[PDB]
Amino acid sequence: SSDVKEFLAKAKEDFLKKWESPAQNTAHLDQFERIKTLGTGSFGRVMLVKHKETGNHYAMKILDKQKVVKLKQIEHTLNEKRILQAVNFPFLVKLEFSFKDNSNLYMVMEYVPGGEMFSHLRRIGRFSEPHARFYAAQIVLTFEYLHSLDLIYRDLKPENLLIDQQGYIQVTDFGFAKRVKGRTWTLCGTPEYLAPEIILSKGYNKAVDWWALGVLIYEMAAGYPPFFADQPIQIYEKIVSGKVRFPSHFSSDLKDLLRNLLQVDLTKRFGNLKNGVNDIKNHKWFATTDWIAIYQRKVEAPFIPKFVSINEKCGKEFSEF
């Protein structure tokens, strides 16, 4: 109650200070030693780098400025960086440094070699209710924090979730996040996770994040998503149908929580009622959840994963980066 209200006041002070004065050019390419390519992003490579003084490793996203412009992602790229530099939470991947040169933008990310929940769920099949509850608890507090800042996450899915070296969740990609008060209308997100009000273009708010949590919790515990089909449009039709069947092994409590999260009626969906997130945190399925020890990372994990051009391009477009 009272500690949560002070904590969020401090959270929001900390955020608004960075949000209204974003940090720019906080490092330089020459401070980093290039090791190997980690993968490909939409606008360029993601490189493993080692800082030269600290020896710490990072995953440096390189974004070609001209490729950003012609894939039409200028404002999104600027917005993603502005949000990343301004937030701080145990379960959010950190933007450690950002800067730009003649050709590229660079987002130097925390690097956690780990294993994404996507692969882990695939290989293990499904999680016990306690294993899943432990993940879902970190998502709840993450959304509590993100929503107090008026941020909608809008992209929850196992691919954006890695299991770090202490076995905790790290939320990995802010490509779709948006700061908004009230409502917004963009269609985005992988189909399996979209709330009905997104599909139907009627406008939506941060309550879509709690629907998507209902989906993830369902998927982690069943081993498959509740709404699934061969084509995206069939997925869309099954979500709007809204008829959901639970496996025979789902507890009475889990079913009851899932029905309050996968709820088409916004006036009834958990998370966005007068009691806020406590309607979720106070549910019987979370009775055994110690929320403070989750936040402190003190709860024992269910498992610990396996062992440039000479000319300046698009200067006006990227001035605030």
Curated annotation (Swiss-Prot):
Cell location: Cytoplasm; Cell membrane; Membrane; Nucleus
Expression (tissue specificity): Isoform 1 is ubiquitous. Isoform 2 is sperm-specific and is enriched in pachytene spermatocytes but is not detected in round spermatids.
Modified residue annotations for Phosphothreonine: T37, T184, T186
Gene field: PRKACA
Associated pathology: Primary pigmented nodular adrenocortical disease 4: A rare bilateral adrenal defect causing ACTH-independent Cushing syndrome. Macroscopic appearance of the adrenals is characteristic with small pigmented micronodules observed in the cortex. Adrenal glands show overall normal size and weight, and multiple small yellow-to-dark brown nodules surrounded by a cortex with a uniform appearance. Cardioacrofacial dysplasia 1: An autosomal dominant disease characterized by dysmorphic facial features, congenital cardiac defects, primarily common atrium or atrioventricular septal defect, and limb anomalies, including short limbs, brachydactyly and postaxial polydactyly.
Similarity comment: family membership: Belongs to the protein kinase superfamily. AGC Ser/Thr protein kinase family. cAMP subfamily.
Catalytic activity: L-seryl-[protein] + ATP = O-phospho-L-seryl-[protein] + ADP + H(+); L-threonyl-[protein] + ATP = O-phospho-L-threonyl-[protein] + ADP + H(+)
Residues at which ATP binds: 38-46, 61, 110-116, 157-160
Modified residue annotations for Phosphoserine: S128, S309
Consequence the record notes for mutating M109L: Enhanced basal kinase activity
Organism listed in the record: Homo sapiens (Human)
Pfam families (UniProt xref): Pkinase
Topology with respect to the bilayer: Lipid-anchor
Effect of G189A: No phosphorylation
UniProtKB keywords: ATP-binding, cAMP, Cell membrane, Cell projection, Cilium, Cushing syndrome, Cytoplasm, Cytoplasmic vesicle, Disease variant, Flagellum, Kinase, Lipoprotein, Membrane, Mitochondrion, Myristate, Nucleotide-binding, Nucleus, Phosphoprotein, Serine/threonine-protein kinase, Transferase
Domain Protein kinase: 32-286
Function field: Phosphorylates a large number of substrates in the cytoplasm and the nucleus. Phosphorylates CDC25B, ABL1, NFKB1, CLDN3, PSMC5/RPT6, PJA2, RYR2, RORA, SOX9 and VASP. Regulates the abundance of compartmentalized pools of its regulatory subunits through phosphorylation of PJA2 which binds and ubiquitinates these subunits, leading to their subsequent proteolysis. RORA is activated by phosphorylation. Required for glucose-mediated adipogenic differentiation increase and osteogenic differentiation inhibition from osteoblasts. Involved in chondrogenesis by mediating phosphorylation of SOX9.
Activity regulation behaviour: Allosterically activated by various compounds, including ATP. Activated by cAMP; the nucleotide acts as a dynamic and allosteric activator by coupling the two lobes of apo PKA, enhancing the enzyme dynamics synchronously and priming it for catalysis.
Effect of G125R: In CAFD1; decreased interaction with regulatory subunit PRKAR2B
Descriptive protein name: cAMP-dependent protein kinase catalytic subunit alpha
